[PDB]
Amino acid sequence: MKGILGVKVGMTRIFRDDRAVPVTVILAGPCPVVQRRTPEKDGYTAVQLGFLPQNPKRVNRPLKGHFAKAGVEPVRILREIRDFNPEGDTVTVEIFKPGERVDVTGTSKGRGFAGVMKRWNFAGGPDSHGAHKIHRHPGSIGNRKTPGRVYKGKKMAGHYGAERVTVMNLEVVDVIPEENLLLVKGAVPGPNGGLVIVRETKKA
Amino acid sequence: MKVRASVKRICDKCKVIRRHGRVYVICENPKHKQRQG
């Protein structure tokens, strides 16, 4: 089910002759499969994929050359595609054809302790008319004695970003398998250099 | 009316059937469709 591993390398608007489609450029490289997780020993029908093979003997005990083109394991480390089943080897980009939607799943740009008014879009407080030390505070976080506690799903200050996020239905606008690229329309999550898995669509 | 608390039989033809606890009334004219809810 149409999965790949890649690097978000930047954004560029390109032109489908009428408009400016604002694509990003995923470097969905030729990912060698390293273990086909079978449903009779795991239950997954998944496939572990790889990335860049130049790992100068940082390949410790997952040496694991039990695939015929294992391509000694990347420190651009293994991930999965959960319902994949390839047919040959080292799945490149040709699985994707231009015009099909994809879900891109990547670690977003973490913003540290990006506290609230940034994490949960709070309206902060007034910048004038009165006191001052509440300009970006959440204000109230509950009710009085009944419940007399903060509800556990409460939106407050926290570690914003650096969690996996999936943008669903990004149109693949082009592939350039001359250098094995993948171009989707829109905002692939993560830094320009970060890791993104690119999956099949959950439209249907 | 439709949903009362006290359901009468205002016709002669109003059967007073009971479908899963609720004492309905069916008829041939639909205005008598009581429900007892």
Partner: protein, 138 residues
């Protein structure tokens, strides 16, 4: 004052084929089996007695109408949800648990009650991939 106590006797790995029995009516046999309320060695602070393995789950028949009546609310998630599960859903997905939730109320509440619940190994049966050892007490 005299001395009465049991010692660590080798356990009783009773199987309970539960094809027919209503839960609850079964489960208070199971909890009375789980504590040592049937052997006369019973100190109440040792969790002796049986390691009951009730198997052959769903088609645990239940009483008169509990098709979407018996509500397994238990999981307060935590802000807005008391999430409700009827018995049809309970027997549909991981059936396996209507007996666990039936005995987890008839066992006591302390750490011995929690240790005693780990003795009960509910499966969806038969072929509990567990056993060669079955004083199948029925």
């Amino acid at each position: 004052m005299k001395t009465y106590v049991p010692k660590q006797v080798e356990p009783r790995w009773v199987l309970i084929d539960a094809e027919g029995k209503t839960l609850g009516r079964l489960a208070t046999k199971i909890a009375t089996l789980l504590r040592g309320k049937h052997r006369p060695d019973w100190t109440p602070n040792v969790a002796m007695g049986d390691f009951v393995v009730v198997v052959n789950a769903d088609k645990i028949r239940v009483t008169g109408k509990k098709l979407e009546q018996k509500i397994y609310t238990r999981y307060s998630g935590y802000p807005g949800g008391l999430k409700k599960i009827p018995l049809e859903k309970m027997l549909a997905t991981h059936p396996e648990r209507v007996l666990e939730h039936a005995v987890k109320g008839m066992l006591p509440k302390g750490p011995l009650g929690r240790r005693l619940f780990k003795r009960l190994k509910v499966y969806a049966g038969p072929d509990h991939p567990h056993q060669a050892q079955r004083p199948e007490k029925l």
